[PDB]
Structure formats: C-alpha cells, structure tokens
Amino acid sequence: EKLWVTVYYGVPVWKEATTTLFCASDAKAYDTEVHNVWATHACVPTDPNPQEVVLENVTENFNMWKNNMVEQMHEDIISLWDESLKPCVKLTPLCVTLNCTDLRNVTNINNSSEGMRGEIKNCSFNITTSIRDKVKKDYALFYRLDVVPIDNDNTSYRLINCNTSTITQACPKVSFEPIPIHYCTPAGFAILKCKDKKFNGTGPCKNVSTVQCTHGIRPVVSTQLLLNGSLAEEEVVIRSSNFTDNAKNIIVQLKESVEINCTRPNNNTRKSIHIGPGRAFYTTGDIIGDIRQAHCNISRTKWNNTLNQIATKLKEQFGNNKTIVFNQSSGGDPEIVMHSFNCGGEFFYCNSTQLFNSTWNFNGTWNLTQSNGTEGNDTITLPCRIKQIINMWQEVGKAMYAPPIRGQIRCSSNITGLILTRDGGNNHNNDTETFRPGGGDMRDNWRSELYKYKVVKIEPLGVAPTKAKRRVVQREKR
Amino acid sequence: LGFLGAAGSTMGVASMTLTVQARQLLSGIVQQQNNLLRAIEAQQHLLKLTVWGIKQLQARVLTVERYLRDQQLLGIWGCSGKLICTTAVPWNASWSNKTLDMIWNNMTWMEWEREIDNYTGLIYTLIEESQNQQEKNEQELLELDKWASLWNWFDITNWLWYIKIFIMIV
Amino acid sequence: KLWVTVYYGVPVWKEATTTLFCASDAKAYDTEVHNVWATHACVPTDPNPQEVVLENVTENFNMWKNNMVEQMHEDIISLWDESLKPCVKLTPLCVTLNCTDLRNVTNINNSSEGMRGEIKNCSFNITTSIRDKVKKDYALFYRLDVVPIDNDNTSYRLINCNTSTITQACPKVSFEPIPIHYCTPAGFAILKCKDKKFNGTGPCKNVSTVQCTHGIRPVVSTQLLLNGSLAEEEVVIRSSNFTDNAKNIIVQLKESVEINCTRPNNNTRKSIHIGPGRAFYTTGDIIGDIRQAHCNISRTKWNNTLNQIATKLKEQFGNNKTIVFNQSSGGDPEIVMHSFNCGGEFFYCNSTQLFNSTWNFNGTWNLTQSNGTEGNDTITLPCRIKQIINMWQEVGKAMYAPPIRGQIRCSSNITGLILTRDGGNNHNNDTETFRPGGGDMRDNWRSELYKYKVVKIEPLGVAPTKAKRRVV
Amino acid sequence: FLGFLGAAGSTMGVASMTLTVQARQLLSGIVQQQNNLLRAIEAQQHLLKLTVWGIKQLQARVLTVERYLRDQQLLGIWGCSGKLICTTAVPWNASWSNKTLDMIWNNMTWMEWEREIDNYTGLIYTLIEESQNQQEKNEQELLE
Amino acid sequence: FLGFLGAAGSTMGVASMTLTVQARQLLSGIVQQQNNLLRAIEAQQHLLKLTVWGIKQLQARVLTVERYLRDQQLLGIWGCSGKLICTTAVPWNASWSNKTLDMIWNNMTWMEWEREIDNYTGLIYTLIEESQNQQEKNEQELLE
Amino acid sequence: KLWVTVYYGVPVWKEATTTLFCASDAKAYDTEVHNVWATHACVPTDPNPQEVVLENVTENFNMWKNNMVEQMHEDIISLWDESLKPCVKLTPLCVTLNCTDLRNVTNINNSSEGMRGEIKNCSFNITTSIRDKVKKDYALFYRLDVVPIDNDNTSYRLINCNTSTITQACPKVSFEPIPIHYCTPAGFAILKCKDKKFNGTGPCKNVSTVQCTHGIRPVVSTQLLLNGSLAEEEVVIRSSNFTDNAKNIIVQLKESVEINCTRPNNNTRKSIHIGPGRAFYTTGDIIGDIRQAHCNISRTKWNNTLNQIATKLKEQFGNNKTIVFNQSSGGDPEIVMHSFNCGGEFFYCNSTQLFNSTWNFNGTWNLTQSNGTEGNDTITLPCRIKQIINMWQEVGKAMYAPPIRGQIRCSSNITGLILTRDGGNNHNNDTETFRPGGGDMRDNWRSELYKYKVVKIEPLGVAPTKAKRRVVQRE
Ligand SMILES: *[C@@H]1O[C@H](CO)[C@@H](O[C@@H]2O[C@H](CO)[C@@H](O[C@@H]3O[C@H](CO[C@H]4O[C@H](CO)[C@@H](O)[C@H](O)[C@@H]4O)[C@@H](O)[C@H](O[C@H]4O[C@H](CO)[C@@H](O)[C@H](O)[C@@H]4O)[C@@H]3O)[C@H](O)[C@H]2NC(C)=O)[C@H](O)[C@H]1NC(C)=O
Ligand SMILES: *[C@@H]1O[C@H](CO)[C@@H](O[C@@H]2O[C@H](CO)[C@@H](O)[C@H](O)[C@H]2NC(C)=O)[C@H](O)[C@H]1NC(C)=O
Ligand SMILES: *[C@@H]1O[C@H](CO)[C@@H](O[C@@H]2O[C@H](CO)[C@@H](O)[C@H](O)[C@H]2NC(C)=O)[C@H](O)[C@H]1NC(C)=O
Ligand SMILES: *[C@@H]1O[C@H](CO)[C@@H](O)[C@H](O)[C@H]1NC(C)=O
Ligand SMILES: *[C@@H]1O[C@H](CO)[C@@H](O)[C@H](O)[C@H]1NC(C)=O
Ligand SMILES: *[C@@H]1O[C@H](CO)[C@@H](O)[C@H](O)[C@H]1NC(C)=O
C-alpha cells in the first residue's frame, strides 16, 4: 500500500498555449522560381502526407473569437503585404492636378458610350522625373474612383488620397495570386481541428482531430462573398460574436460552391512613364476595342437556393416565425457597399445589389427552384468599377497603387461563405429581421478557415504514484 | 505520425502501458522532422530573416528550448536514462488521497495532472531533485570505502573471468 | 589518495558582460498605449521578484566600470531612435519664417502680463502634398525654437534648422516613463548591495541576487534625478575620483522633495499637412491669458535637503569646510539650466532659486521648519519650452515634439543631484563649490545601477575526494 | 531551504548538497517560461518585427540554450552526461593546492576554492578527456 | 578545431584503433572549446547586432546547436545517450552487406562504408530504436 | 553473428551548403572611427589555426560548383548595401550642370598633359537645407563621371544620373580590403585541395581540411588580380570549358608583379552642404598643376610572366596555335580599362601596353634580361580616375566616391589574369586570340576560394560487430 512518484516522459497531457507558427507551402512554387507571390517565397515545403491523429475519448473546448491563430494570421498577411510593397515605387511625385479629359470613346457614343461612360478618364499632368530642373507633361489613362474632382472644374481631378495617404505602386512583376498556405506549429505544439460536422463559433467541439499544419488556407481577402475558401459540410453554418448585438458581424459559411465567372473583357495595352531615378510609374496606354463593362456570372437558381438555404438557418438561429430582409449594405466603405475581391491582380469593385435583395415569408414556400432554360436561368451580371488605388482596410495613412494588368483578365472563384450583419431596426411588431451584407475585416476572412483550428502546447513529462520505488542499490557488484 | 494520442484512454489502459512505444516513435519523429527541416534549409538556404524567415527562426529556437528543458529536468531528477523512472520519493495524501486504481484506471492522464498541478512543483522541482542530490553524495561517500575498492580491484585483477573458468569446469 | 570529482551546480559566479532584456509591468499592457520605450515589447514582469540574499558573502562591486550602464545607455537611445524613426521628418517645413511679437496683436488676452516674444507668431508659405500648391500657414515657436534670420526684425527660422533633420515625434506614441526591469538571461544573475550606505565601488556585506532589476523609470533629467530611487536614512555621495574636478559627482537623496510643474496655457492643435500622409502638428490658438511655466518647491525642504548634502560634502572634503552652492557657469542650455520632460513637453527651468547658497561653516544648521505657508513662498522656478530637442552625444539627428492639447500637470519626486566640484583658488578659504552637472545619460544610469552587477553563473565545478572511478 | 545561491557562503561540503538548486535554474528563464503571454505578443509574436528588445530577448535565449548545451556536452565528453556528481579516475595533484579534505570541505567555500584552482583547471579537464579514452580502451578490450 | 579528426579516415579497423577512442573525445572536446571561445568573444564585443555577419553568426549558432541535438536525440531513441560506441541487439540483415567482417575492418573506409549502406542506413536506425523498445518492453517485463 | 554497433564521430562528410561567418582579427575595432566591410562584427580569428592533413584521402573539388564563391558574392554585395544604406544620396544633385572652365589655365597647366579638360569647373543652380535660398557652387567633376547634354558645349550631367540613383558613400568608411577568414560553423568542414596545380575540377590527390578559410581579401578588380594568392611552381590556367570561347579564362600566376600606382596630385577636398544634415563632398581646386595617374610595371618581369602564361596556353590548345594577347574587345569601361581601387580611390588604367604581344610558338625566346635596371623598366599605364561607380549587376543603385585629399599611392601584387578566347576566323591560322576580361566579381572570389570545399560532418555511424547489447539485455 506504498506509492512512490514515477516520472513518465511522453504522457498524453497538453495545455492551451500560443506559439510562433511557420508557413509550409508546396515546393512546386519554389521550383517555378516565380517568387512573385507576396508570400510563400521562403515558406518551407509541406510534408507530402499530412500527419493527423484521432483524439478519441477527448473533449476539448474550441473558441473562434479567442483563436490567437486568427490574430497571428492577420499580422502575418498584413506584414507580408507590407514586405512586398516596401521596395516598390511610390506615387508621391504623381500628386499633381490631373487634366482628366473623358476617353475619346465618348465621341463613339454607340450605345451609352459602349459598356460604361466616365469609368475611364484619360488624365494628363506635369511630372518631374530623375531630372528635377526639367518638368515633363505626361498622360495616363486612369480609371474613375482613383480620381477626385478638385477645383469643381470640368476636367480638374486628382489621385484619390494624394494628401490623406502615401500611394505606393506595387511592383508590376509581383503576382497577387493566393496559393494554399499551411500554417504549422513547432515541435511541442499542436493545432486542434474541430472535426464536428457542425460547430457554433464558441463551445465544446465533440468530433475533434488535430494537425501539425493547417490546411491550405489561401490568404484570399474578399468582402461579403468569401471566394475560394473552405465549404461548409452538408449544412450552411452562421457564426456571430453576439447575434442579438447589431455591431457584431455575422459569418455565413455556404455548404455548396457557387462558382463565379469574373472577367475583365477589355484587351488593354499597358504603358510605363519614368518618374524618379530608376523608378517607373506603370499606367494603361489604350483600351483596344469597344470598352465593355467588367462583370461576374452566377446562376440565379443556385444563388436563389443559396439565399433560400441561409434564410432557413437564419430563421432557426432566430425566430422561425419572423420575416427576413436581405437589404443591400447601408452605405459605408466602397468595399463594404459592393462585393470586392482580387482577380488576375486587379481588384473588382462589383455591385452585389442583385445578390442581396430577395426577402422571405416565414410561411412562404420553401422549395428549391429549378432552371427554366439558358435565358430563364441566365446569369446575375454585376456592374464592376476597377479601383487601382487600394487603401489599407484598417489604416488610412497607407494606400497602394495597383499596376494595370495588360490583356484580358478572367477568374473562376468558388463562393464558399458570406459575411452578413443583422439589423433589428425596431422591426414593426418584430416578426422581421434584416441581414445586410457585411465585410471589411480581414480577420473575419481568416476565421472562416481557422474556425476549426486551435493551437495547444504539449507536456510529455508527467508524475504519478506507483507501488514501485527507486532501488537505493548503487554498487553494480554488490 | 508526430502525435501520441490516447489522451482520452484513462491511465493504465493498454495504450497508457504502450505509451513508451508511441513516445519512442515521437522522440524519433522529432528528428524525422528536424532532419527534414535541416535538409531543406541546406538546399533552399532562404534562412534570410523574412516575415516567414523570422517565424521559422523563432520556431527553431522554441523547439530546442522545449527539448532541452524537458531533458534538463530528467537529468537533474536522475531520469535521463529512459522515459519511465521510479523515484524514492513517497506520495503524500495531501498530493492525492485516492487508490492507485482510482488515480489510474479511473483518471485520464490530462485529468490526473490537473489535480496534481497544485503540487507538481513540490513533488519533483524540490523533493525529487533533493533525493538525487542526497543519493549522489551517498554514492561517492560510499566510493571512499577502502576494502570495497581493493575487492573491486581483485575483480578486475581476474576481470571476473575466474568464475567463467568455474563455469567451464561445470 | 584523491580523485577529481565533477560537481555540477556549484554556487560559483564570475563577472561577465552580456546582453539584457526589459521586463515591463503587465499593467502597461492593459493600458494598450504606445510607449516610446516599447514598454509593451518588454516581457511581463514576474509577479514577485526573487531577492534571495547571499549571506556570509563579501562581493566587491565596481559601479564605475559596470557594463550595464553602457549597455542601457545604448538601449534607451536606440528605443528613442526606432520610436521616432517612422515619423514626419519636418524636412520641407524649414523655409523663410516671418514672425510677430505675440499671437495677440495687442493686449487681446494679456499682452502686458504675457511674456512678449515667447509666442513669436511665425507665418510661412509651405507646400502641401499637392506638388503644384503652396499655402501660407502660421505657427507658434517659443524663442528657444526660433533664430532671427537676415537680421530682419520679423524674419526668423527653426533653431536646429540648416544643421540637421528635426523629425516630429509620432503623436500617438506616449512619453510617460514606465518602470523597466532589466532581467539577466538564464545562467546569469544580478547581484544587489543591501548596505544602507554604499560608496558605489568596493566590498559589500549585505549582498542579494535578483534575476531581474527593480523597476527603473528611464527618465532623462539634468542637474536633478526625478522619480528616482531613494537612499537609506542618509544622503550618499559617489564619484570615481572626489579629489578630481571633472568627474561628475553623483548624489542619491534619502528624502524625496516634491516638485509641482505645469503649463498654465490652454493650447489647441493644428494639423498642417506637409507631404502625402504626413501631418505636422502645431499650436493653433491659445484659449485665455498666457502664463509662463513654473515649478513649486518648498523652502525648508530644499534648505534641509542641501544642509544634509553640505554635511556629507564636508565629511568628504575635511570636516572644517564651507559648501557654496553656485549655479552652472556656462555651456549647452542642457547642462546650464535644469531641464526635464513633462507630459510630452520639454521644460527648461532657471533653478537659480535652488542653487543660490553660500552657508558659513559656523552657521545655524538647525533643520529649517515651516512656520507659515503664506510666508514660505513655494520656490517658483522660471520655466520655458524648447519644442525642438537635440541628441546629447550627436551633433546631427534633432527631434521635434508635437504640441499637447490643453494645460499639462506634472508632480515628479526630486531624488538626486549631479554636481561638478570646481577647484577655485578660494578653496584656500575652505569654500568648496559644487556646480550642477549632467549632460550624460550614463550619469543618470550609474545613479540607479550602482547596486547591481551582472555575473555569469558557471555550474561546472571540480573537487578532490578519496572516491575513485570504479570500472566494476 | 536555501535560495538560488543560498549556499554561496556555505563551505564546499554544505553547498555540495544544494547543487541541484542552481542546476535547476541554469536553463529555466522568465522569457523562456513566458510560453503563452497574457499579451497580444504570442510566444514573442514575430519578435515584434525584430524590435530593439525582440533581438535582445532572442539573443539572450540562444545564450541560455548554447551555454546549457556546452556544459552538458562537457559532462557528456566526460561520460557522466546524465549524472550530476561524477567520479573521475584522474589522481589528484599536490601542486593543485596541497590541502587536507577537512579544510577544503569544512572551511573553503566553492567560490574561494575555485579562485585557487583557477590557475590549474583546463589541464584537469583534458586529464578527464584522456582518462575516458583509457577507460573506453579498457572497456573495448573487455568487449573483445 | 586544432586536432579535428587529427588522423584521417583509414581502414575502419585502423581508424577504429586508439584513434577513435581518442580523436572522438578530442574532436567533441575542441568543438566545445572553440564554441566557448565564441562565448568570450561575443561577451567582449557585444557588437553582433542583425549585421550581414551578425545574422550569419546567429543562424550559424542555431544550426550547430540543433544539429548537435539531432545527433543526441538519435542516441536517446536507441538508449545510447551515454557511450559514444554502443552495441545493439539488432543483427546484420545480410541484405545490408555480405562483406567479410575482416575486410569491413581491414579493406574498407567509413566514407566508402556508408554509401553502399546509404539505402539501408536509415532502415537500420529504425530497427535500432524498434529493438530498444523490444528491450525496454522486456525490461518492462523484467520489472526493473 | 554480426550485430550492428552505433559508432559516434565516424570520419564521414557530405557536400553541403552552410551559412559561413567572416572571421577577422578585428585589429581595426580599436580604431572604431574607421569601419571597413563590417570589420567589427567579424569575430577575432583563432590565434593558433591548425590544418589537419587528410592522409590517403582523394576528393573532387568543383571550383565553379563552389557554394562559397556564391556566399562571398552575396555577403560582399549585402555589405555594400549596408554601407550605403545610412549614407547620403545625390538625388537632388542630378540637376543641369553648367560645366565650363575645364581648367583655370588652359595654357601652362594642362599644356602637354592629355588632360584636355578631364575635370570641369562645373557650376549649377542647386538648392540647400535653407530650401528657400538657392546658391550656385563649383566642383571639379571627371569627364568620365560627366555626360554632355543638348551638346550646347555647356549643359552636362552625371553618366548614370537620369537612369540610376547615385548614393554618396560615407567618407568616414575606408575601402581598404582586409583579410576576411570565411569560417564554417561546427558540424561542417572546408576541404582544401593541396595539389601543386588544380585544373579547377576533378579528383584531388593531396587533400587537407580547415576549420576556417585562409585570409581572403575582398579585392574587386578587372582584367587583373591584385593582392591575391600565388600558384605553385607553375602558372595555372583554370576554366569551366576552355575549348568553349565564352567561358572566362581564369589564370593564376606563380610569382607576384609589383604594380606601383599613385595619383600624383595634392587635392583640396572641398565639401558642399546640400539638404538638412546632408553634405556632398567634392574637390576644391588642385594644389598646383595636374599630373596624370599612372602605374609602374617591370617591363621584363611582365615579358617573362606573359611568356609563362603563353606557354601554358600552348599546353592548352597545342603548341602549334600561336598565343596572341590582344587588347580588350570592348564594352563597359569597367572591363575595357583595368579598373581597381587604390587606397579608397578607384582607378581606370589603359591596358593596351600589357596586352599587345604575339607569342608565336615558332619564335625563339630566352626569357627577358633587365640589364638596364635603371629606366626603360616601367610600362607606365595611362590611368584615368572615376568617382561614380555603377552596380556591376543592376542598372540602378550607382555610388559616388567622395574625393580623397592629397596624393593617393598604392603597390599591389599582380597574382593572375581573367581572359576571353575569341571565336575568330583565324582558328585555321592557329592564333589563340586572348583578350583581358572582367565585370563578374564571382571570378574574383573563385580565384581565392578555388582551394576550398565546404562539407557537412555526420559523426553518427553504423557498423556490424561480433559484440551484442548484452549489458542492457539484463535489467
Ligand atoms: C620579350 O622577350 C622576347 C625574347 O627575347 C622578345 O622577342 C624576341 O626577340 C628576339 C630578339 O632578341 C627575336 O629574334 C629574332 O627573330 C627573328 C624572327 O625569327 C624567329 O623565328 C625563327 C624561326 O625559324 C627563328 O629561327 C629565329 O631565331 C626567331 O626566333 C629572326 O629572324 C632574328 O634573326 C636574327 O636577325 C636579327 C636581325 O634581323 C638579329 O637581331 C638576331 O640576333 C638574329 O641574328 C631573331 O632571331 C624574336 O623573334 C622575338 N620574338 C618575338 C615573339 O617577337 C620580345 O620582344 C620581348 N618583349 C619586350 C616587350 O621586350
Ligand atoms: C557474398 O559474398 C561473395 C563474395 O563477394 C559474393 O560472391 C561474389 O559475387 C560477385 C558479383 O557477382 C562476383 O563478382 C564474385 O566473383 C563473387 N565472389 C566470390 C568469392 O564468390 C556473393 O555474391 C555474396 N552473396 C550475397 C548474396 O551477398
Ligand atoms: C584536368 O584533369 C581532368 C581529370 O581530373 C581531365 O579530365 C578528364 O579528361 C579525360 C580525357 O581528356 C576525359 O575523358 C574525362 O571526362 C575528363 N574528366 C574526368 C573527370 O576524368 C582534364 O583533361 C584535365 N585538363 C583540363 C583542362 O581539365
Ligand atoms: C537653534 O539655534 C539657535 C541659535 O543658537 C538657538 O537659540 C535655538 O534654541 C536652537 N534650537 C532650534 C530652534 O533648533
Ligand atoms: C542658375 O539660375 C540662377 C537664376 O536664374 C542664376 O542666378 C544662376 O547663375 C544659374 N546658375 C548657372 C550655373 O547658370
Ligand atoms: C600542332 O600542329 C603541328 C603542325 O606542324 C604538329 O606538328 C604538332 O604535332 C601539333 N600538335 C602539337 C603538340 O603542337
């Protein structure tokens, strides 16, 4: 009946801790030696076979809002972007009055100036390059949004954020293509994966596994609709900090991939004007062919069902006997008001009014509408304005100019999630709930993937009472 | 696999008795990973302190500290030899008032430590380390025995082969 | 017969020089504010420091050759350098500065009472982020920040302009000094003298060790040590060579003297844009009468304080001695006039009413007591503001401080004095003189680090014993 | 009982029983024991992008890691890697301070005894290195 | 490192003479020695600060330490963390080599020896630690 | 029975790539004021280095496939990046320069010297820190660093000003090369091929090993190799593919040739303050007249050394082929003119005289005799001076050398050549046309890291034995 401490190295005991994660991406990118991605350049290779064990009989508590991974991932992507644009030309010298004459395409009225009118502004200006004593008059086919009327004059515009921020042009060579990034924990640490088929933002996650490396979390930054992300399993899942609270954002994860065909159907000849010693400012030379409106194609039926599905879950989350309004964003940052995301290296400010507009009766028919022909289903095209000057999402002092991508641009992203925002607005006799689209927080975008991951440390050493005792005998012979 | 698992299995379960194996595997996985990492750093050689570079560097240091600290304790406790090591320190009812069957067959390792954490320090950081210090002293204090050394020398004088000759006669 | 016995963990330490790290209090974290000294970067301070005492020990100390002083000298200046590194450079700001006597054209507020000239309302045509736009803008520069130019009664310019850059201090960063705990890496330790009186260099009977220094506020002050540590029931005087004059004389006080300092000016902030995403902050309008900055000091307290110091100095330079407290002869305003930072605002005070004392050796030394507060006018120190500040060891690299919106209130604790013995021929009359000193971040560091020294711990040890390695 | 360096003034004998106290804090350090911090910085976050202090803390860490390792490596060369108090077969030398064990362990403190042996130390270390060579050689003959 | 491998790799036998028992401890000894010399240097200058060379030395220090650990970790996996030359219970799968033990030790150099085994060398290591477990499981039955 | 036994420290290495740390005596750290290629960082070299000779060891060394050359190149470039990072930039100085008054006295001064206005009393309406006030100043700029504009016989600018940023190097920083010992970390080793002459790639008979490389000077030169190493008993020609014409021909000499070089002028070092805390450095008149920089080569020694190289070239392409040392083909001046740095000052020396010799195997030559020891033994190299150095790899990132005060004198040790074989139509004529080359600093490092090869150290080793783990078997 005598127990003595017996130290065991390798006991299966762990503790919720935080550690410096390291990136691990496929080596193929290193072999291609493109090294144009704003990350992955020095990112180590990934274990060909992911190593995961089943934590059976285990019940770990998981909290998305308290997942330090999201905070770290946020800092990582923020720095990676800064790192990439750190050594690239700035548009600080380009800060002059811009004589923005409308594109000669206005002379070609055709049909409402072809696709769009005033979207592109052939602006001219006086610049001082490496030669300071000598000034130079140059023209740049800038788009709208990037220009702001200044003197209230007809052809008097200026680069947006000329004084509010320092416009830095991202090096044209660099490529803004998110490639599967796998965050990995160092030895003595382990990412816990909420394996539960369905899991609310916070709470004990039953079905649970673990990984030493996150799945390929593409650092895709997109507003409202989450493109190219992790699809929900079987059931669309809505996650909020405080659903009843309005300020809080609402993370809706779609179970099915709504493929979106976005393209920039304009053949573009890119130009470059030298501004500063060994510094060249890239702009657009000419829009060869009729100027057409950039647009994205999405099956109404698919989206109609997707809005039907989410609506049901929103009803389950709140009052199943309440009305539900998908009103469009109530103003705010252009990114928040209109779906935005990167495609081919150009950010597409695309309208999403058509997407978020339909409403639903608590007792309305809940059937999945089928297609009624190519013309019947058609596609939800979106008026898109390309804003090259892109400001930081959480800082005003920093803004980045975007090099024009020469030639036709086209992408095929999968819609995998949607950020919404509940607004009670004193619903008359309640029985109503508005869910305008949300976005603008990169963290929110990262949570959509780390929703299951949870970093924990490991403690192999362990002591326990055992009838056995250390034998005081020391002499080998006696 | 890099993972011990078997956390849910309560202490004493065949898995908890076969932990040694999974631990030998893990200790090995550490090299399988370290060697892999080293091989790459030899090829890519992008150890440049980049955004990921610094991360990799911090990560490398953390792993070393983890391995070193756990081994240091083992060494001071006189347990550097193998994972499992019985010690001479008896358990106090204050540390726990449960039968071995309870503390084991009934408690999982995670659950167990949780209760002992309140005493974990006094158990090993103090008494256990002291035990070894006293043992070490007694060792050399017993190595000054003159007759023992002379008899021990006699053993090396024949290198304990005389007994083998007896076996040869047998 | 004996055999070497390897003893691991022997309690033996040796003087060493190593890098140290700061461990700021976790309360600073909670505040969630950007400190210039990166108090947030500093690791959390261990709740209770371990001050294990080394009994039966007599460790010698050398405060004048301590590495930590030099190491921190660099650490504090680097912290400032990296803090103001990414801030507006105020480079284009310098141009032609046409100025007026006061922001008030006449006695609009208090021209008569207001120190005429202290405003020097200078106007200038600066270029905004738009390269093709020039704008006339006005600003207020205390005489200490404007130099007459072209000998034009109204033409002036920034003081350290032409010579070096004057980057404005990033406005978000706070300059509130937070206690800092320099901690030794594992395998290293800091030894602390507990002796109630310590010369600074020599043996120590009460010696303790700490893995972490006590909290030290990195305050930079001249002719004075503010918010510093206190001696023990005795003012202590330390100098590498007391019989030498140049060697600045460090004094640690046993009693703290309160110093209330404030800016009685309600000021506003004007963000003149100078460059894309670069906003220069200046004072827009002062709301009300203009009152010069000052500091309140007790007569008796300061009197009693000097008395004790004077005695210590006679005990240092022969009993029979007359300690004459003179002021600084001349040199950089930094070391001529007592200067200190207050709520993100530099203050140059004329401590003439703190360093004016002859005191005959044969005089009443009875501790002066307060009889009537009305009669005991709290010494008021004439204080001004030098917004542009300059590095102490470097001619170039000057820095600007953005104005703070509103009146500022400070109340630090006098805790030390820096002095410079001058061997005037009058010494033949035993009239010892100790002019105020300063001008060296190191002198301030030596005052707070005298009791600490860092030693590497060597756990490896050998010893002879009758025990022998047995093969069997 | 005694603190980290509590046996500093204690005789070599008394201090010999407290060796573990120091050995326990050779690698154990506040920065290393931080693990997860109650601060936005997580495991030194990212060295705060190599801050003035981030470097210091990083550097200070490597010195604790290399130093402890160096000390172990030594004991490892001397064979008694895991052991704390070892027993060498190196015969003692009279020149190394002709003193009786009573004075050494009941009077001289480790700090004092070291200062004396400092003059002749590295030599002893080499004598152990070659003694293990002889030991390994002898053991090899037995293995054969 | 002064006498770093003072004697070059001869026939594994001639190399496995006193040379191995000595050079090994001398090599590891001088390795620590030169590492200790670096400690005095960085203590004397303290100029190593994220410089082209400062980053080089910092990464080099980390490399050496982690490469030392991997070697020692491996010794630990097959309970050989004590003696530099530890025997195992694993027999030699003739597939690894048919070479006469004499030749292996009389007409073969370590440099050549490892290559023909570079394929199995890793396979062997796994058997070495797997057996260590078999032996421990047996020790776990010897109840000692 | 055979039981595998683990052996620690088995003498086995493997070609590896490892980060190398510079090790210099740092004897210049005491002179903290003086900084050179980060001398302070370089940890002091071991006072007693020992080369362990690898007896009965043969190894292959690929002087070209040598990672060290690559690392040195990256470290050398990064060193310059760090040195120029905090230094000033001539961005605002790229103004229209009214370059006139080539020289004060176009009569007695330049007179016969081929000066023809090398320096120019160039004046320019540039601003200063005052910003508001704009002042015109005059500074002598070398015709080499200046480029004419509008051909108005007046408007001029800096050769790279419009297309490249010029960063003024900090004057306090010296550019004297110091011995840098590239030391490998523990667990790694640098093999040393000790054959008398090494083809550059192949099995090496004599092989040794070093913990650190021998002192290697960071010398950057073109068409020549200065303060370098010497060959063994014989000039050695080294190339990746000699029979290929493009591959640069690396030659290493067995003996050294003194190259007395000096700028024989007393120069006043005028400095111009432009921009807050920014000061440009230039020349304030030349004290006295202008003497053209020149280099002294032993006429006979050179004749002999060239003959030695020629004989080896015969041994490389058949004696039948005549060795024709032609002058540089053409291209950037850096390569066209043997250009090096003297005492922190960059030279540009015409090398036509040193490369104008046809060594026809069919012509008899009994070496050369310096009977006229006094005179007629100094091939005076017409040396020009340049201050604006362009990055050897990129178009941008140029650097200005602040003028040095007084006469700049030096004496290096020619220790080899960098040559270029030409695909001429005279291949049938058998006339190996070899012309001097340069512009690739990697070659400079190869010429010194040729005898080194970094390899990993794997101490752990396995070996079958007749012994078994019986000791631990019983527990
Ligand atoms: C570096 O050193 C070399 C060697 O000294 C100098 O060049 C050689 O100089 C010698 C004279 O000292 C030259 O000799 C002359 O060559 C003529 C050409 O024929 C050559 O080839 C035939 C092949 O059958 C040989 O038989 C013959 O000997 C030569 O090698 C000969 O026609 C000359 O013959 C005689 O007549 C002349 C006068 O016409 C006399 O001066 C001679 O003494 C002799 O009686 C003679 O042999 C030799 O050709 C040179 N070689 C080259 C490569 O040009 C370099 O000039 C020197 N460089 C410098 C810069 O100093
Ligand atoms: C065992 O060793 C013997 C000796 O090396 C091997 O026999 C040799 O086989 C090779 C290759 O075909 C021949 O070139 C030799 O002539 C053989 N020598 C002798 C002495 O017979 C044999 O193959 C080995 N067996 C295995 C399977 O390892
Ligand atoms: C230098 O020595 C190498 C050998 O180390 C010679 O290279 C071999 O030459 C033969 C015949 O010329 C070839 O078939 C081989 O392929 C070559 N390489 C090897 C590795 O054997 C070489 O000819 C010598 N000379 C030069 C200029 O390289
Ligand atoms: C102080 O000195 C004065 C003058 O001698 C004397 O009258 C008085 O009693 C003394 N005591 C006090 C008030 O300290
Ligand atoms: C530059 O321009 C100013 C203003 O016209 C003039 O005074 C000055 O002489 C000019 N300098 C040169 C070099 O022409
Ligand atoms: C070169 O060509 C000549 C022709 O005269 C021939 O005699 C000689 O052998 C060839 N090769 C050598 C070794 O020079």
Author numbering:
A (entry chain A): 32 to 146, 150 to 309, 312 to 321, 321A, 322 to 395, 395A, 396 to 464, 464A, ...
B (entry chain B): 520 to 689
C (entry chain E), F (entry chain C): 33 to 146, 150 to 309, 312 to 321, 321A, 322 to 395, 395A, 396 to 464, 464A, ...
D (entry chain F), E (entry chain D): 519 to 662
Task: List sentences quoted exactly from the publication behind this structure.
The envelope glycoprotein (Env) trimer [(gp120/gp41)3] mediates the entry of human immunodeficiency virus (HIV-1), the cause of acquired immunodeficiency syndrome (AIDS), into host cells. Binding to the receptors, CD4 and either CCR5 or CXCR4, triggers conformational changes in Env that ultimately result in the fusion of the viral and target cell membranes. Here we report the cryo-EM structures of two cleaved HIV-1 Env trimers solubilized directly from membranes in A18 amphipol-lipid nanodiscs. We suggest that the MPERs assemble with the gp120 C-termini and the gp41 α9 helices from adjacent protomers to form a membrane-proximal base for the Env PTC.
Extensive 2D and 3D analysis without imposing symmetry constraints yielded two 3D maps notable for their recognizable MPER density. These maps are designated Tri FPPR.1 and Tri FPPR.2, with average resolutions of 3.4 Å and 3.5 Å, respectively. The MPER of Tri FPPR.2 chain B is composed of two helices, MPERN and MPERC, separated by a short turn and flanked by α9 and TM. Immediately following the α9 helix of chain B, a sharp 71-degree turn at residues 664 and 665 directs the MPERN helix towards the α9 helix of the adjacent protomer [Protomer 3 (chain F)]. Sandwiched between the chain B MPERN helix and chain F α9 helix is the C-terminus of chain E gp120. The MPERN helix breaks at Thr 676-Asn 677, introducing a slight turn that directs the MPERC helix to the membrane. The initial few TM residues (Ile 684-Val 689) appear to retain a helical conformation. The MPER of Protomer 3 (chain F) is poorly ordered in both Tri FPPR.1 and Tri FPPR.2 structures. Relative to the nanodisc axis, the Tri FPPR.1 and Tri FPPR.2 ectodomains are tilted 30 and 20 degrees, respectively. Second, the highest LD/N values were observed for the gp120 glycoproteins in chain C of Tri FPPR.1 and Chain A of Tri FPPR.2, whose C-termini potentially interact with the well-ordered MPERN helices of their respective protomers. The Tri FPPR.1 and Tri FPPR.2 classes differed with respect to the tilt of Env in the nanodiscs and the specific protomers in which MPER order was preserved.
